[PDB]
């Protein structure tokens, strides 16, 4: 629900193993949704105003995920807010600058580490 379109992560197809290792090394956990065609890596951000997740999804291009040499397409990262327990947004959604800054820094380092 907030996109980070300026990372350049999307520009080059990359081996799954590279994304996998770089993401895990920067504290991402992969999401418990098991799919030969897609992986999603979340970075959990806990802030005074709530818990957020920064999500970097990647998609199978040649080969199945999670074979290390499978070529994947990384897509535009997305920042979301958790609305526990029931998903209902009462005061809509804003993202604190500190959270956005955290996201820009992590993504910058991810784009570098992968490359």
> What is the secondary structure of 24-44 as a DSSP string?
HHTT-EE-S---TTEEEEEEE
Contact status, residue 11 vs residue 113, Cβ threshold 8 Å: no
Whole-angstrom distance, CA of residue 79 vs CA of residue 7: 13
Strand 78-81 versus strand 29-30 pairing type: unpaired
List CB contacts of 106: < 8 A, sequence separation 6 or more: 26, 27, 43, 54
Whole-angstrom distance, CA of residue 2 vs CA of residue 37: 24
Query: Residues for the chain: how many in total?
Result: 115
Strands (E) located in 48-112: 50-62, 71-74, 78-81
List CB contacts of 74: < 8 A, sequence separation 6 or more: 9, 10, 14, 19, 56, 57, 58, 59, 114
* Measured distance between the N- and C-terminal CA atoms of the chain, rounded to whole angstroms: 26
Q: Phi and psi of 51, rounded to 5°? A: -110, 130
Experimentally determined by: X-ray
Q: Which helix (H) or strand (E) holds 3?
A: strand 2-3
Class of domain 1-115: alpha beta
Q: Name the resolution in angstroms.
A: 1.8
List CB contacts of 21: < 8 A, sequence separation 6 or more: none
Long-range CB pairs of 42-49, under 8 A, 24+ apart, other chains included: 43/103, 43/106, 45/99, 45/102, 45/103, 47/96, 47/98, 47/99, 48/96, 49/96
């Amino acid at each position: 629900s907030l996109k980070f379109p300026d990372t350049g992560l999307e520009e080059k197809e990359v081996a799954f193993s590279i994304v996998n290792h770089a993401a895990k090394s920067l504290g991402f956990i992969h999401v418990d949704q098991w799919d030969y065609e897609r992986v999603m890596f979340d970075y959990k951000i806990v802030h005074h105003e709530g818990t957020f997740y920064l999500r970097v999804p990647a998609y199978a291009v040649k080969g199945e995920i999670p074979r290390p040499s499978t070529i994947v397409q990384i897509m535009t990262p997305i920042l979301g807010k958790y609305y526990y327990p029931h998903g209902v947004e009462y005061e809509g959604e804003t993202f604190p600058q500190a959270v956005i800054d955290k996201c820009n820094n992590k993504l910058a380092l991810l784009a570098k580490t992968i490359k």
